[PDB]
Subunit: 186 residues, 4 copies
């Protein structure tokens, strides 16, 4: 993995997603060199950069032009990005312009989760995987329900991570806010 | 329990200890109206205030004179403090001046945990309880090994707490750093 | 707090609720000697026993006759139960037969959470507290929306508890399933 | 990742290590096709199988003849194993017979952690990575002190994982015991 500290960040754009979470997203996604992936709400680019180096084509979407700008910087810096199509704009409309996908990671929904998912279902190639990253309690509930209603077998794993911070004398355990991963299939 | 946001802070002083943790500290301590308690490293006063309203006499110790002033402000602010003896100074010398104790909560050791624990065993009335609050990995190990070496039946419980926060479009789970409670048999 | 291992379990009855959770429930409930409390879904009696020794009258409700029997057994074993009115039956019908309450703990809803909460609100005395114990993701969401819709100031805390256990001459950390407490402003 | 439920368990051999933990071990290990790895205490084979399909040669060690049998069995069922050298015996003895390593995962130490680590240092190729999986509190402390003492830049990450399970028409969260990963520098 590309460590979190190698991500240039713009304080107005969240991310990158916790390395341990991005690691699990990749395990769940099972990126293949012939896969076409979409990262809805690319933010700082934490998920996009990892997908960039493992799949054929990645479509990174974001409402915020700054997120688009920051994701491109991190890509440029890590020598990735020539197989990444950046798309500024609201997800539903952006999603309609791309081809079918093998992998769909929803890093942000902005109130349009349900709409985003329905669309993703219609574009998901057979054997495709959907992974929704949820920090809001509502999102965890809505992602679960949405995917079930669309006919998927849904699973949810919540991660509570703590890392050692050498805080002058000992190692203090500093926790990261919990993040849940709602993912489809069996 | 006095909510955490009703504690007057001071930048140099850590605390108050997470309400959920203070709650468990009290459950493990089993405060009695005829108990004499000592709060080693009172900090902001989170543990001292709770003990104040439940036991006969509380001895609150701290190296930081600002921890002493902040604990006083909080004691006065909540109408408590007439059964609290504040003691500024390093714990080992401060501990030697107090009578025997029924309850001992170690909220901070500053490198002298082992010494602090030994003195505490010497002043512990029968049936007394010792509870060490540990945020450093090293402290969790030492508190366990030390209390066992002093002949106590030891236990440890770690709490990972997450609370909700109305975040910009919903409810975000904001985790608190993990805190372990190393305690001796009652 | 009455230790978890001092509770007799029945195969068809869940519980007792984790001591650390019961501890927090009590901190949030702030039991007073003149309080009238209701424990919806008493199960094994974990919450009922604690309330029994702190309030004036407790109304313990449960669908399962085996739960009513176990809660009754555990009270007797602990010399409690004279201020406890056991009520077998579905929560809504039973809730309508009791007087107004100062404290309401919902330990189980069985699909009728919303109904149970509406009824509790209609019977809550001024300054009363409601605490819902949620292990199901749906319940955490449902309790939050419902309490707000009923005009309450809602809060949620999710505890992840780990307890040390002897293993290989060392100490292994054993986790308990996470439990969330959804409670209203006091 | 090879799903957890796709490993055959022997009742006397622990494992496989939680998929989410094995996922992170791989992220931290950064397996390369020309890497030589050693899995100290292979148990059920959770770490060995993952390394098998990513590196050049893997040396899987275990005291338990049954652990060696379970690992070979799981290797065979997944069509792996031709690049895995199984070694029954105590780790230090076994570690001395293998060539230098790029990756070292310590899945079990059995009281000889310090010795095992000192030896791993003596055979670690430049740019090599060491990752110790710790479930015992003592091991977390020990791994840190030892690795610091051997001159490494040490880090610790503690994972608390919860997975949803269908219960009473809802989804309850089921936690796994916490596991810490103590790993070395660049
Ligand atoms: N409906 C929508 N359409 C497009 N982008 C959206 C959106 N709702 C939210 N977003 C974007 O969702 C992103 C979530 S932050 C994502 C961080 C990223 N996973 C990382 O690892 O760096 C934000 O940049 C936000 O603007
Ligand atoms: N050896 C020692 N003697 C006295 N005070 C000490 C000490 N080691 C640490 N401390 C004190 O330990 C405290 C830890 S912060 C404690 C916060 C408190 N439990 C609350 O709930 O508000 C600090 O104020 C620090 O100065
Ligand atoms: N609508 C309802 N009416 C009555 N009891 C209900 C109910 N829905 C669920 N329950 C009961 O809710 C209980 C939840 S288990 C509660 C365990 C208890 N808190 C303890 O500490 O021991 C079960 O015994 C179940 O039958
Ligand atoms: N000194 C030692 N030498 C060799 N094996 C050892 C050892 N100390 C402990 N072990 C082994 O350590 C293993 C730990 S269990 C490992 C499970 C494995 N990580 C999985 O994912 O399946 C056991 O099989 C045990 O016998």
């Amino acid at each position: 993995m590309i460590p979190d500290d190698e991500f240039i960040k713009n304080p107005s754009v969240p991310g990158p997603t916790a390395m341990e979470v991005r690691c699990l997203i990749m395990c769940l996604a099972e990126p293949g060199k012939n896969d076409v992936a979409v990262d809805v709400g690319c933010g700082t680019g934490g998920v996009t950069l990892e997908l960039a180096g493992r799949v054929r084509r990645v479509y990174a979407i974001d409402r915020n032009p700054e997120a688009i700008s920051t994701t491109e910087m991190n890509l440029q810096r890590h020598g990735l990005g020539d197989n990444v199509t950046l798309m500024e704009g609201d997800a539903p409309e952006a999603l309609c312009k791309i081809p079918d996908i093998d992998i769909a990671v929803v890093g942000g929904s902005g109130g349009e989760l349900q709409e985003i998912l329905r669309i993703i279902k219609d574009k998901l190639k057979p054997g495709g995987r959907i992974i929704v990253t949820a920090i809001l309690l509502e999102t965890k509930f809505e992602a679960m329900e949405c995917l079930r209603d669309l006919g998927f077998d849904v699973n949810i794993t919540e991660l509570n991570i703590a890392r050692g911070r050498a805080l002058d004398r000992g190692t203090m355990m500093v926790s990261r806010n919990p993040v849940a991963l709602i993912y489809t299939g069996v």
